Amino acid sequence: MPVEFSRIVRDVERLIAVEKYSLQGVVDGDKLLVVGFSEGSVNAYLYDGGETVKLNREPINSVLDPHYGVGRVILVRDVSKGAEQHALFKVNTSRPGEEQRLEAVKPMRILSGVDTGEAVVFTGATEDRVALYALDGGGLRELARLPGFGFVSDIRGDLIAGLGFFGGGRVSLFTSNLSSGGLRVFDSGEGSFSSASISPGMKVTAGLETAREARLVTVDPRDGSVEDLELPSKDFSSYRPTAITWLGYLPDGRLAVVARREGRSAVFIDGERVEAPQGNHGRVVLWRGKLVTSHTSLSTPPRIVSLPSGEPLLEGGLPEDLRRSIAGSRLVWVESFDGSRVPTYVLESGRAPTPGPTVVLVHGGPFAEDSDSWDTFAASLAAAGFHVVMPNYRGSTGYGEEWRLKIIGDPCGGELEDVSAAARWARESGLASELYIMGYSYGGYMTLCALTMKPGLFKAGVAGASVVDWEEMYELSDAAFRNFIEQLTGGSREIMRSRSPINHVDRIKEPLALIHPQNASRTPLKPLLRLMGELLARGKTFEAHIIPDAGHAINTMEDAVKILLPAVFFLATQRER
Amino acid sequence: PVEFSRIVRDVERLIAVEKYSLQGVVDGDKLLVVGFSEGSVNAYLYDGGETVKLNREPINSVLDPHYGVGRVILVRDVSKGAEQHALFKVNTSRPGEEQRLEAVKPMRILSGVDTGEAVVFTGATRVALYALDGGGLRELARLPGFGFVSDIRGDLIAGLGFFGGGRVSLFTSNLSSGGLRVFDSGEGSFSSASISPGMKVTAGLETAREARLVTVDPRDGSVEDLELPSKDFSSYRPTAITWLGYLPDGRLAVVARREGRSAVFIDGERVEAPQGNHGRVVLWRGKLVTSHTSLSTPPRIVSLPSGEPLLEGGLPEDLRRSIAGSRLVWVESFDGSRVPTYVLESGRAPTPGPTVVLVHGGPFAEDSDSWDTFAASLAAAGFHVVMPNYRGSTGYGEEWRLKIIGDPCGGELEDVSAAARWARESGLASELYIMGYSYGGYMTLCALTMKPGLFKAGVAGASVVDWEEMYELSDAAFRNFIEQLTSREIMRSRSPINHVDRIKEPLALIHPQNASRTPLKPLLRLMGELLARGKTFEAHIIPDAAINTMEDAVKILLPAVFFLATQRE
């Protein structure tokens, strides 16, 4: 059967075009601040009275977390054509579309930020350092240098609270001061801190993710004491979460917590379970006295909903035919090499037979999760007639500290076996007639890792924005990613070499498709050029697609088409062979 | 917003549109036509409006039938993409019933004529001229090279041969005794041949400057110019003779060419024909019929002199209106010589509008008024197409072809650049893009280096990046061509890999992954140099990359069109 290219393009472009919204906070006069992919690009909008107002001109990457009622929004715009060197732009909410560049900040990798209306506190990674900056009337000030990736969580008064990846894959809590600066790190011996919000008593309420569970703890920044937080309702404690998505104090003092287990989240106010649509939820805001959150699911693109009715305020609509191309989704537990149960989401295509063509779609990160959340790539594969298997290999989030840290020191090892077991499960369970592997960033590294370490398991592979050589990538990384590479490999350069797919090209026996941004910082192109030379010299058949002016974060419809369409075409072509 | 799916939908139809060629008249006054679509070839009978398929499985070609014979000889590949073929006979009264001609072993069938009594064909295994009759197969002569049967009248067989010397020779043979008589044209090259009722050989003699209609006496090899009753043909001043043949009533039909377009002549008198290029001419039910193609018209069967299509592939109302009209312009170049340039205008672009200079490869080739899927796809996507016959092109005299010798991406680049400046000066181009494949891709890269600012973006396909590297890396034949094409000093200066610093516009690379004539290793070096110098570029490397199928278009054409569509924002 011939590949139906034109339908694939039409399906792919419609799935990319559907509006996707992100909830950021409440500004001005009870205006919802939302980030949305609408009209083919990423923009920032004010929502109020059933209408949206565009705040930015040219597409953005994100905005900083606003304090309630501040009369401005701080845009974050990549000004390096995908290299993730960002700049900050202020937009007065009273004059949307009028941007003022914050010229006191030089282009750096902006990692997080909070705007109190009086000061703009953020974390940025330059070539030599990750630091916690503050921008006010007295100029730009560095408050502290951070030993790796750090993100601002909350600011109440003079106290700043955040989260830091400062060692061995565990997340530490940190505090600083707007007036005096400095840094104080809070490490937990039970697990990692997940979210953080400063209480009215100037404490730090934080989520603590231990080996197999998660709970709320109170951290006194004065002496570092930690105690379990008790809530006036017991719904949260009996919910027994394994991960905490986000928490924060509402302006009326109530504590909102979004926690999750088995790829689905729940909303709690002062411990009480609030009804929310099935799936995954973002931050919770108080808007005109009502609770608003974001909602997403494997069949529902990210949307803005009110609680507890679950009724949408902003959502993109999918055409019925695309809705039908996803027959359903389920979570199954795949047994891996050492007897661990790998939580795996399966997306059953309504346009494939059973057994039928199946793509194992490996998520990136690796500190990320295949959850019941919208995946544009997974939707395109179901629309093109592929079942999608999404394994949360070890190193994934959402299933406890123990499962997440198992990857530390073992890239392309135990987690690769998890991917293989899910693939073998698909065929052995009667779901898959043939097996393909596909992934981007770290998922693209896994594809190369799979085709080199386990030839013959899959029929063909798609590696997008992949890691090819840990050594060269480390030499081409900034302060943050160099530290991140060190934690992932456990400091071992021997792990950096033996676990690099570039050093195992001889083993490849399957057709390979390479897709790569031309000027991405996280995953540089120069090692990929070396990989293609290796493939050619060793007589391996491959195809490569290098997309320019795009990096890790795509914020236009055209670039998203150009990095996804080659993958679907390649797999559809392979299916007829 | 770029409508990627609208571009792909249009490309599918331009690839899938049924194209027709005219083979002759068979059985009871019925046209024999060949239909080609998506690399699939079929043979049909046309009489009344409905077409009757003659074959069961797709074929490779058919042999040339004599007027009115009651059968067709099909040529079909013995395997998938195998150069060796088999012969199948089909009675025109029982279509769909194929009888394999088992007396002919599988071989490379080169040409053939069916008289209704004997099947005479050339085939390569040696290369020989064969005859198949009731008594079986006979080898009439062994040919010193690739040869092709042109015509049979009585026992006299006439054909054309690549028998050495660089020129095409005329040869005769006998259907009874066999044998081989070769006629060298000296300063000339035969292009077509038909045997006159008086058993002389009328042939087209293409030369350096102007083509000649000559008579060859097969008895003594005397060559003399043929003067026709009407003088329209001589005054037409053709540079090539596409095809000629005697109609059943003894009149001589001639299709000749000049400046990328052809004209139809009957005993020297010109017949009105739709603008473009034409195939063979037949007399069918007292009317003249031929095939017609142009930059705006896929190959089709038309009636003369009205030009009314008898058989043409369908194109939707939108796509048809998007591909709107072609013209020939004479672009004044840098040296005073005029560059013959064809222009295909888009109905989806304004004037001035986005315009792509589509550089042909070879370089010994020609941009004529013929159907081109690339140009049509560009026009369908909202681009005017400018196709210049830069020095080195064929079809405009030996002097113009030889002027490129010793000046790679030098003199001929100016002709391409002059064509781009012409598109601007004449008010057609609002923004300029350059695009080419094989040698045309080499032109694109060298143009972006030596003429930055001229074009807004470039697409380079199957290009040559470094002649110095190419010469030693390539085989004898290609290396010999490189020597005549480019002094090693010129080889390095004309190689665009050494001028990557000068590139200033986005560049799209489309390259085969496993091509011996265009290796991938040099292009990987170019991509490394582009990245090290901060040059914006897009790259598409596809294994096993002539657009016959949609699959071919997806690999080689869609990335170019997608790139240009987003480059215009």
Curated annotation (Swiss-Prot), chain A:
SUPFAM superfamilies: alpha/beta-Hydrolases, Peptidase/esterase 'gauge' domain. GO terms for molecular function: omega peptidase activity; serine-type endopeptidase activity. It catalyses: Cleavage of an N-acetyl or N-formyl amino acid from the N-terminus of a polypeptide. The active site is at 441 (charge relay system), 520 (charge relay system), 552 (charge relay system). Keywords: Cytoplasm, Hydrolase. Pfam families: APH-like_N, Peptidase_S9. One of its GO terms (biological process) is proteolysis. The keyword Hydrolase applies. It comes from the Archaea. It is an enzyme of class 3 (hydrolase). Belongs to the peptidase S9C family. This enzyme catalyzes the hydrolysis of the N-terminal peptide bond of an N-acetylated peptide to generate an N-acetylated amino acid and a peptide with a free N-terminus. This is Acylamino-acid-releasing enzyme. It is found in: Cytoplasm. GO terms for cellular component: cytoplasm. Its EC number is 3.4.19.1. The keyword Cytoplasm applies. It comes from Aeropyrum pernix (strain ATCC 700893 / DSM 11879 / JCM 9820 / NBRC 100138 / K1).
Swiss-Prot record, chain B:
One of its GO terms (biological process) is proteolysis. InterPro entries: AB_hydrolase_fold, APH-like_N, Peptidase_S9_cat. Its main location: cytoplasm. Its EC number is 3.4.19.1. GO terms for molecular function: omega peptidase activity; serine-type endopeptidase activity. It comes from the Archaea. Pfam families: APH-like_N, Peptidase_S9. It catalyses: Cleavage of an N-acetyl or N-formyl amino acid from the N-terminus of a polypeptide. The keyword Cytoplasm applies. It is an enzyme of class 3 (hydrolase). One of its GO terms (cellular component) is cytoplasm. It is found in: Cytoplasm. Belongs to the peptidase S9C family. This enzyme catalyzes the hydrolysis of the N-terminal peptide bond of an N-acetylated peptide to generate an N-acetylated amino acid and a peptide with a free N-terminus. This is Acylamino-acid-releasing enzyme.
